[PDB]
CSV table of C-alpha atoms in Angstrom, one decimal:
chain,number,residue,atom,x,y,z
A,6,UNK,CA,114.2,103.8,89.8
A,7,UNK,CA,112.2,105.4,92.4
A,8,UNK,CA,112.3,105.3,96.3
A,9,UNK,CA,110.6,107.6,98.5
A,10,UNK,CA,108.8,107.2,101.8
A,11,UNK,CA,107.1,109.5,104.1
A,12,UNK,CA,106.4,108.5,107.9
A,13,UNK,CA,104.8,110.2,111.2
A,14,UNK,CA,105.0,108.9,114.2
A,15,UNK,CA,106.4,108.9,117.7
A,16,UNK,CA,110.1,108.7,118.5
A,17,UNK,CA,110.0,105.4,121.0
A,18,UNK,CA,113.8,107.0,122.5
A,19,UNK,CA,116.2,109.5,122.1
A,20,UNK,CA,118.5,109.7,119.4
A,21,UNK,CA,121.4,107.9,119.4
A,22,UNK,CA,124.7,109.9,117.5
A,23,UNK,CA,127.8,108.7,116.6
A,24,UNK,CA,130.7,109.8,114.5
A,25,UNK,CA,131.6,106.8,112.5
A,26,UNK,CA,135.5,106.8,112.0
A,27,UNK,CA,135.6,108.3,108.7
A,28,UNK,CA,134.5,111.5,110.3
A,29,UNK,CA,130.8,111.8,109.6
A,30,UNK,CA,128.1,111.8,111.4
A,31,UNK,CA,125.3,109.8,112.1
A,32,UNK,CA,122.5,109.8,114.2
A,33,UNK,CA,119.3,107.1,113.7
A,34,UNK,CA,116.3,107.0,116.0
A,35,UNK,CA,112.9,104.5,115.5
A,36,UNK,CA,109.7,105.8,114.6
A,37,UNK,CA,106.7,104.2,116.6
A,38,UNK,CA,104.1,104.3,113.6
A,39,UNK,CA,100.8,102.9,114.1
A,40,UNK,CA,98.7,101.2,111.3
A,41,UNK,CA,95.2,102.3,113.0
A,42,UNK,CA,93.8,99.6,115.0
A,43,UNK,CA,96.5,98.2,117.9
A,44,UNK,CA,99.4,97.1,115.5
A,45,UNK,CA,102.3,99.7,115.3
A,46,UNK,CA,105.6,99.0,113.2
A,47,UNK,CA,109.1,100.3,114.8
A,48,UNK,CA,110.7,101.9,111.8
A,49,UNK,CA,114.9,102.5,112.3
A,50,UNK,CA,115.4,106.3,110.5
A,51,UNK,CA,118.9,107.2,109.8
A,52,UNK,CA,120.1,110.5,109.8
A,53,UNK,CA,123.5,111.9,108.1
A,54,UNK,CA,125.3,115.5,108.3
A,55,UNK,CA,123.5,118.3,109.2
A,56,UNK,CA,120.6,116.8,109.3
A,57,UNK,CA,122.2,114.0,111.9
A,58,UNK,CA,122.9,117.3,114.4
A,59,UNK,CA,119.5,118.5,113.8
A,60,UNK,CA,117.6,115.2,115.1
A,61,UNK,CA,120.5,115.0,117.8
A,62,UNK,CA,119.7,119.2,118.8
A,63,UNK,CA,115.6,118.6,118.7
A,64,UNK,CA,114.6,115.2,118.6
A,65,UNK,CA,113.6,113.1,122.0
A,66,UNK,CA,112.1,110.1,123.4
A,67,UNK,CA,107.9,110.8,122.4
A,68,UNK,CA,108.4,113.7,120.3
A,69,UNK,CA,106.0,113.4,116.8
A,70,UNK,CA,107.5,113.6,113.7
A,71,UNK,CA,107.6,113.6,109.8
A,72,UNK,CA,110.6,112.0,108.2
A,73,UNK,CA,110.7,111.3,104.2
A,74,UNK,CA,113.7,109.7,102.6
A,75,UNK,CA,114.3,106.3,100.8
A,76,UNK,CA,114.3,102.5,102.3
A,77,UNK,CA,117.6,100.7,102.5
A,78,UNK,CA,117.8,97.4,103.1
A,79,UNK,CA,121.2,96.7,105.1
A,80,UNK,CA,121.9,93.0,104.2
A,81,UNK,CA,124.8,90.5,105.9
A,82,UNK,CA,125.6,87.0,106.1
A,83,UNK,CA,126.2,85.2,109.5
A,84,UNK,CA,129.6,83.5,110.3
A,85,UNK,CA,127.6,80.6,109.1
A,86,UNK,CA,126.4,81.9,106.3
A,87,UNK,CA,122.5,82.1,107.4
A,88,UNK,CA,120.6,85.5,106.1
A,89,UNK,CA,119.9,88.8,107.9
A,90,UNK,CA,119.2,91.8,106.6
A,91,UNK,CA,117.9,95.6,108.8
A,92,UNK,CA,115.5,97.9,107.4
A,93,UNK,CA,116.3,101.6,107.8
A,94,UNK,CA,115.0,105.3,105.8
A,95,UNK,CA,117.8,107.3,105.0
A,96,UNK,CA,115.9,110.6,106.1
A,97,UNK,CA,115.9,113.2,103.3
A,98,UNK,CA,114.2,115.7,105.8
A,99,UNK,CA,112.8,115.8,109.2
A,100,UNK,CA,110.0,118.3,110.1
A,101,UNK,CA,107.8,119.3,113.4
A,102,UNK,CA,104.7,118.8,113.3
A,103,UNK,CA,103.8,120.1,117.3
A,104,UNK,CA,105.3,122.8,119.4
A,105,UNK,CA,106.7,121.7,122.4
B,18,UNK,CA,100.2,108.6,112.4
B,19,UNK,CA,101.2,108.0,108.5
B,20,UNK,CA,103.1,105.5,106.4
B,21,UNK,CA,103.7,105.6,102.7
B,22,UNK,CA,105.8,104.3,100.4
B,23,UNK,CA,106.4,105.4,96.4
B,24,UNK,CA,108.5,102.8,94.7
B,25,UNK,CA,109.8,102.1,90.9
B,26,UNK,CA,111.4,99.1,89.6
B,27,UNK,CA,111.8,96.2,88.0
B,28,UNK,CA,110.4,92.7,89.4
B,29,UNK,CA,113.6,90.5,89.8
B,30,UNK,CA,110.8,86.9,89.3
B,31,UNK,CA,107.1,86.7,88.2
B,32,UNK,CA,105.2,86.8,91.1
B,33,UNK,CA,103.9,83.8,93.3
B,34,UNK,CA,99.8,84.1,93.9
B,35,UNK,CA,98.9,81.8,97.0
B,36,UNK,CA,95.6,81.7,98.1
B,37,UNK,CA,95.9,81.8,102.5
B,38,UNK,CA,93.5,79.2,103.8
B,39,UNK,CA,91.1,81.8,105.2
B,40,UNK,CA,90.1,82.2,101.6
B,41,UNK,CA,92.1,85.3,100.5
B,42,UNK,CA,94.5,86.0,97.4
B,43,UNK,CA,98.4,87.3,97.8
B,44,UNK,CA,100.1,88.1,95.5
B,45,UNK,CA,104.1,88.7,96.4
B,46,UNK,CA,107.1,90.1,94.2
B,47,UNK,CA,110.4,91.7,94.6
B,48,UNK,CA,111.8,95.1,93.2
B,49,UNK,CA,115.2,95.5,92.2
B,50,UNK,CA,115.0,99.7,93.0
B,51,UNK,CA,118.1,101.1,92.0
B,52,UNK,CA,119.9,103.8,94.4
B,53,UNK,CA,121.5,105.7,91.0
B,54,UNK,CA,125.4,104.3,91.1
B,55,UNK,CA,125.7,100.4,91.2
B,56,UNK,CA,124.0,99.5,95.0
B,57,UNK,CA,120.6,98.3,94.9
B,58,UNK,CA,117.6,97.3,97.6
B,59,UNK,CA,115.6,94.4,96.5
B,60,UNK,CA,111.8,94.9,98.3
B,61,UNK,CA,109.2,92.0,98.5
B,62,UNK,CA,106.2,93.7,97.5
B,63,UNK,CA,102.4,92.2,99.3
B,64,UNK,CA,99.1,92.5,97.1
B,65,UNK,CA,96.0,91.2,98.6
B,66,UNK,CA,92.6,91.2,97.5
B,67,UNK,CA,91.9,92.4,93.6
B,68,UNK,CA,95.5,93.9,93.6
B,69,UNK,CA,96.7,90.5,94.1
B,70,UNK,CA,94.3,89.4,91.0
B,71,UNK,CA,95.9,92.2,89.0
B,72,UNK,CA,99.7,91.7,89.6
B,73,UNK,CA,99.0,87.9,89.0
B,74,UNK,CA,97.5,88.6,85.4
B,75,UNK,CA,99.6,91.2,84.2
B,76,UNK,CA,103.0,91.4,86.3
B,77,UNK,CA,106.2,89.1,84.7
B,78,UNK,CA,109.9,89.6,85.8
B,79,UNK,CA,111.4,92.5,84.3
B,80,UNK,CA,108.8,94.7,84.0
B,81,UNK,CA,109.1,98.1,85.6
B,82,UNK,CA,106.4,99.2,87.8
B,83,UNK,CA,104.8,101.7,90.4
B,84,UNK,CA,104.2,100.5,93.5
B,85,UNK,CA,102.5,102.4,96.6
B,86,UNK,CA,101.5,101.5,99.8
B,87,UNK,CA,103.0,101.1,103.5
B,88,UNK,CA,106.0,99.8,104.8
B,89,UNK,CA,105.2,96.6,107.3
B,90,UNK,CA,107.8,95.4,109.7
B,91,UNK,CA,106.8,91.5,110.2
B,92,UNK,CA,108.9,90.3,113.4
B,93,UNK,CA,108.7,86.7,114.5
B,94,UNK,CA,111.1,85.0,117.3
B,95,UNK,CA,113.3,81.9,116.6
B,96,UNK,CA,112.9,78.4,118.9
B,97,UNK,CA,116.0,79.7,120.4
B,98,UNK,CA,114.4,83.6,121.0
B,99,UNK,CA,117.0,85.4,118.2
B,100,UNK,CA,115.1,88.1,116.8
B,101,UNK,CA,114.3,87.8,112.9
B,102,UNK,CA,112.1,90.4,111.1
B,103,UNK,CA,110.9,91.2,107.4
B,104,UNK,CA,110.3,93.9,105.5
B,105,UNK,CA,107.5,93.9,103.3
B,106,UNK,CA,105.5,97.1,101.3
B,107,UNK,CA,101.5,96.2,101.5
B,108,UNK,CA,100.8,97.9,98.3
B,109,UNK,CA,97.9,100.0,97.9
B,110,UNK,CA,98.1,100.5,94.0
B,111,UNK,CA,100.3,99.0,91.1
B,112,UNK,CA,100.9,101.2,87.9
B,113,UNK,CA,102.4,100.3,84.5
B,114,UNK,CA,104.9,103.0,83.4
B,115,UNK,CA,105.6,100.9,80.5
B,116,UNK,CA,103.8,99.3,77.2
B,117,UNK,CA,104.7,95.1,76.4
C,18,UNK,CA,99.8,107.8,85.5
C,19,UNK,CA,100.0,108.6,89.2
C,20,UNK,CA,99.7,111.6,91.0
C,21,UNK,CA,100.1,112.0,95.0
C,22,UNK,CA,99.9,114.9,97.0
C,23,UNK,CA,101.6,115.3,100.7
C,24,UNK,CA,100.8,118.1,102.7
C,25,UNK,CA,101.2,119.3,106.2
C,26,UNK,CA,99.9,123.3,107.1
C,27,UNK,CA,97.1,124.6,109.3
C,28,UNK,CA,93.5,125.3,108.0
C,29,UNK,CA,93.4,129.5,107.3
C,30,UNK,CA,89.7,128.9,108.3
C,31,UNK,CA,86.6,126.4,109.7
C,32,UNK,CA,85.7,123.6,106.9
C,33,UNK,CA,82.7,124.9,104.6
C,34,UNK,CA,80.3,121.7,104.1
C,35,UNK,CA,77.6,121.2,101.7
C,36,UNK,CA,75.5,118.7,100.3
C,37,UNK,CA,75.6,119.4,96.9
C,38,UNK,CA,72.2,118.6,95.1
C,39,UNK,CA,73.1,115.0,93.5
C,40,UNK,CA,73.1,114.4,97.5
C,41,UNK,CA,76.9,114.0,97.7
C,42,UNK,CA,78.9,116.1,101.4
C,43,UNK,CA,81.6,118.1,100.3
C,44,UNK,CA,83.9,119.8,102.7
C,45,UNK,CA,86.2,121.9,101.6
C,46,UNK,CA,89.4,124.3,103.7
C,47,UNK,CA,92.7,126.0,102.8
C,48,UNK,CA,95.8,124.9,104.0
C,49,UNK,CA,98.6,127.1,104.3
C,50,UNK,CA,101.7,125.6,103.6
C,51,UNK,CA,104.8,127.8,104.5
C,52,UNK,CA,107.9,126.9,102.2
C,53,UNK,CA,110.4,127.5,105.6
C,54,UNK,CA,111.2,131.7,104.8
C,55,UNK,CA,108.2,133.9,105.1
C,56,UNK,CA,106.4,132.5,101.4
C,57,UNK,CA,103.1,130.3,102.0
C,58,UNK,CA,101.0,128.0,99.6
C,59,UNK,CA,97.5,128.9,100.5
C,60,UNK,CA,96.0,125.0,99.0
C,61,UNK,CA,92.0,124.5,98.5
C,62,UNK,CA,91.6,120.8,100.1
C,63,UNK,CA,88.3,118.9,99.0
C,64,UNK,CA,86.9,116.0,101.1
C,65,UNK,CA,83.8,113.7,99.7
C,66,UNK,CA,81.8,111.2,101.7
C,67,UNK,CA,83.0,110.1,104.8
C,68,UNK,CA,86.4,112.0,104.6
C,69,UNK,CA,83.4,115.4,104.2
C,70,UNK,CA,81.8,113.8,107.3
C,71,UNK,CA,85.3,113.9,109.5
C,72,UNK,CA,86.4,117.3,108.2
C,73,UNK,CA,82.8,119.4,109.3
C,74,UNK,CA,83.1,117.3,112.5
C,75,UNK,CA,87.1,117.5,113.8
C,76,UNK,CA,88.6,120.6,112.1
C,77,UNK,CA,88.3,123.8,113.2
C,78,UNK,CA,90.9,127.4,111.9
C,79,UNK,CA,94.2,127.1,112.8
C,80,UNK,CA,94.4,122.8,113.2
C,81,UNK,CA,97.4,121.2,111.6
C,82,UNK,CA,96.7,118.7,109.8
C,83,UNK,CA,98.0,116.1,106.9
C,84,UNK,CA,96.2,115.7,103.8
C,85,UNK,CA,97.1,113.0,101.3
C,86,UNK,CA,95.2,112.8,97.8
C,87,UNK,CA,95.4,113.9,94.3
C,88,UNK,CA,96.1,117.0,92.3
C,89,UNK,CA,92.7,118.2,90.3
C,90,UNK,CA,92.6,121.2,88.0
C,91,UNK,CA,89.5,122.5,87.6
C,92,UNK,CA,88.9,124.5,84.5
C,93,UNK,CA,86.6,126.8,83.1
C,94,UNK,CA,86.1,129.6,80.1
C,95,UNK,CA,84.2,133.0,80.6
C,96,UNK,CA,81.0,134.4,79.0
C,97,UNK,CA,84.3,136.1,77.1
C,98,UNK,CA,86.5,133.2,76.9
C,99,UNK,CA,89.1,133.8,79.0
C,100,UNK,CA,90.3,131.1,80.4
C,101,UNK,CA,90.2,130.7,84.2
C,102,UNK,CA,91.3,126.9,86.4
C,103,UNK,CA,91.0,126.1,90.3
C,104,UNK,CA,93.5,124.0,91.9
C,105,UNK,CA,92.2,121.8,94.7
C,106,UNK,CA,93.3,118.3,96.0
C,107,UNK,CA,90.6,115.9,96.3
C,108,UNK,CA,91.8,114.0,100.2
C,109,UNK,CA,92.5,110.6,100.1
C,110,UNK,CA,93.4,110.8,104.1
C,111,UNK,CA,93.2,113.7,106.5
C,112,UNK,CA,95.7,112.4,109.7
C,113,UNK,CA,95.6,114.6,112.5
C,114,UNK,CA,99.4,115.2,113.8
C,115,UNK,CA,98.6,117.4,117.6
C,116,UNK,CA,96.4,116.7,120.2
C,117,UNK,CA,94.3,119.9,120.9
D,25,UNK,CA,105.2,122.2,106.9
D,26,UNK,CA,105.7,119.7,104.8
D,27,UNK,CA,104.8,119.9,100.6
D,28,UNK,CA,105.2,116.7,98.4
D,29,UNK,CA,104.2,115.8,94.9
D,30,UNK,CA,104.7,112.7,92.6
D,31,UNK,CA,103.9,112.9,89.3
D,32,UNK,CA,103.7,110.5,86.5
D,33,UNK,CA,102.6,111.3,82.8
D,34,UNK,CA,103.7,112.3,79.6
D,35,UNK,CA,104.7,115.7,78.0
D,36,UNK,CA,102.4,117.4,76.5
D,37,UNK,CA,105.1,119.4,74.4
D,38,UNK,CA,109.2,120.0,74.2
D,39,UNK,CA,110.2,121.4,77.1
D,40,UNK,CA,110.9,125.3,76.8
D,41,UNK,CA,113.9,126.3,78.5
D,42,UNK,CA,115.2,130.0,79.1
D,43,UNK,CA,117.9,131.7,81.1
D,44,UNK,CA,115.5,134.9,83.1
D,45,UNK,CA,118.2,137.7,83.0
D,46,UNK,CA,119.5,137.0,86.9
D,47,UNK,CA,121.7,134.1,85.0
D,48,UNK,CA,119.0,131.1,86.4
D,49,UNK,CA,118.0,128.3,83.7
D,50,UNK,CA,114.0,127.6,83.9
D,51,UNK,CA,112.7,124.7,82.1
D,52,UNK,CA,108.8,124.2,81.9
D,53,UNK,CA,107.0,121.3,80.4
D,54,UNK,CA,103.6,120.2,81.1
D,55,UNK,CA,102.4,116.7,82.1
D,56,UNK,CA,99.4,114.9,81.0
D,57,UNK,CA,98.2,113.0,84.0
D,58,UNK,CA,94.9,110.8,83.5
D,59,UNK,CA,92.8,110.0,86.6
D,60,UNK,CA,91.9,106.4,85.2
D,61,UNK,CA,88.3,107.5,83.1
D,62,UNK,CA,88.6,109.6,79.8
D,63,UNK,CA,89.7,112.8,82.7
D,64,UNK,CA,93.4,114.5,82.4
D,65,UNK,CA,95.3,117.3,84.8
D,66,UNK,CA,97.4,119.3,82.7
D,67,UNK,CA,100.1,120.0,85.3
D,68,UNK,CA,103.1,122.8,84.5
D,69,UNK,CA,106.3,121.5,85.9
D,70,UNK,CA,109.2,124.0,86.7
D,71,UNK,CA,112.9,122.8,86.7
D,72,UNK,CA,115.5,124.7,87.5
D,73,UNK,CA,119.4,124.9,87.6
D,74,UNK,CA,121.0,121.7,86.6
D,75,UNK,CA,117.9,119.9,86.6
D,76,UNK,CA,116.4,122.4,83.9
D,77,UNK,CA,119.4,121.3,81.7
D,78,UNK,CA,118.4,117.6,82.3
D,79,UNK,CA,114.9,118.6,81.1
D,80,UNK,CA,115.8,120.4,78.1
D,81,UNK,CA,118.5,117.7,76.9
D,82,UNK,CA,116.8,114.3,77.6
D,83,UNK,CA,112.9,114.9,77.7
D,84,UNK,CA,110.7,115.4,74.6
D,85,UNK,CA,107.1,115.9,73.7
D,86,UNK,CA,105.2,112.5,74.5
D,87,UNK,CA,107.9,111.0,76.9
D,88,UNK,CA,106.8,108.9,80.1
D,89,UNK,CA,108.2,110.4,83.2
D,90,UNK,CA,108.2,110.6,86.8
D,91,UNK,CA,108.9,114.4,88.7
D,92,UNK,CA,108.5,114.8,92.7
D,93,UNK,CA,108.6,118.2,93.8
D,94,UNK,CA,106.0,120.9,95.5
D,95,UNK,CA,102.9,122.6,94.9
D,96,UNK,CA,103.7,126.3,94.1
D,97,UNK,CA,100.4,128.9,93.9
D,98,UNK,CA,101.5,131.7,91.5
D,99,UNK,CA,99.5,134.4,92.4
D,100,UNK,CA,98.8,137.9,90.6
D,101,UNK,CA,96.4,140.3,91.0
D,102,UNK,CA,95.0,142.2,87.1
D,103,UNK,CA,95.3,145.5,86.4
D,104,UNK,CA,91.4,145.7,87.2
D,105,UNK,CA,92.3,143.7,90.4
D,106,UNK,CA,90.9,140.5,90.1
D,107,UNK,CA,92.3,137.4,91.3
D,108,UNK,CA,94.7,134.8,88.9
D,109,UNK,CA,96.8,132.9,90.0
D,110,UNK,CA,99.1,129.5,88.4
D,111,UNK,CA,99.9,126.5,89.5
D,112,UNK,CA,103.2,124.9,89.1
D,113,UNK,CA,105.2,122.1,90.5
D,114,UNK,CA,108.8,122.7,91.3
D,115,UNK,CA,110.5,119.6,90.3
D,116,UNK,CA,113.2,118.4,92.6
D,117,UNK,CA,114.0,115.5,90.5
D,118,UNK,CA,112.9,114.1,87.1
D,119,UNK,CA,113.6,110.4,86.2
D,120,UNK,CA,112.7,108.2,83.1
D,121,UNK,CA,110.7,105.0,83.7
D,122,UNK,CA,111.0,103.5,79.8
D,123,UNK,CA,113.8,103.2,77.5
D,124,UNK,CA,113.8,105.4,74.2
């Protein structure tokens, strides 16, 4: 198989880090990316080890960004059984695209 | 801003061709897309237009694929205002990898 | 087959334009592409048509800029027979990424 | 920057595969990628490490396969000075779409 996606847009907030309890990190952010036109999809990115400190150390609310990695689609079942599933890219990289 | 998506797997069904009333062809389908490992992310591919035409004609379940195009985030409210969303890739070309 | 190219760099130089005689715009520029390290990919970009038209009008030296399209080998003997190629990539999208 | 390629064709040839006397494996191979159209890029491809020994075990002349990796510009000037330089892609990963 095959999986590989490549995205710019804007960070709509900082990044949000966490160390889950197994003792890695993980930091995800959404990427405001526009389908011009007025339609935009919010796209949850997922970062993990060093990469995960890098997007915490330079990433913030606004910034513009490239991000490639692979979709995952996180599934679950409700108490009552009723399907929901999140979208997310596991980033394989994150570059800069502007100064700041 | 920039979206794309490179995917490669196998169609899980044969794909359902519906004709919306405003007078133009989808085509939908699902890829089984292997993380390699035993996980795997099942994405409901969109064709419209004459790429719905072609994966109607030639696509069955099983067959491995290409598929390009941009990752969609379609979001809709319930009665009661819990948040629901779907992930779809609009494909923007489909390429046999394979004989039959 | 597929084949899809995703670059980010700055233009070394302003777009050259011409109408070629079949009465067909090409624009053509160079994209240096560092490999991040001090090593660059210098890249020949061509645009046609309308892409051509946006190129001549919105880039100028030093933009950066993301080109998506295909990989082209352009080939050619000598009077002598030596055997010479061009790589280029023919633009499907040029996506501007600052403001300027 | 940012520097992506996917491929997909067939070899052209076995790969060739030698150890350059720093201790490095290279494997080269060179893919036939139509434009679909009668047209074909001959592209080199460039793996190295363990993904030159992938290469050398499992692909063969006239295989179906999918690289991503980046555009690299080999550059050399002649004895006489004038201008050659290769194109390459370094492959960061090689994977089968058919059976065998």
């Amino acid at each position: 198989s095959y999986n590989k996606v490549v995205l710019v847009g804007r960070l709509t907030r900082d990044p949000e880090t966490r160390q889950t309890l197994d003792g890695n990190l993980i930091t995800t952010f959404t990427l405001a990316v526009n389908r011009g036109g007025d339609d935009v999809d919010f796209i949850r990115i997922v970062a993990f080890r060093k990469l995960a400190e890098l997007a915490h150390n330079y990433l913030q609310k606004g910034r513009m960004v490239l991000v490639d990695g692979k979709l995952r689609i996180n599934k679950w079942k409700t108490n009552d059984g009723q399907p929901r599933s999140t979208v997310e890219i596991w980033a394989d990289n994150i570059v800069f695209v502007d100064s700041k």
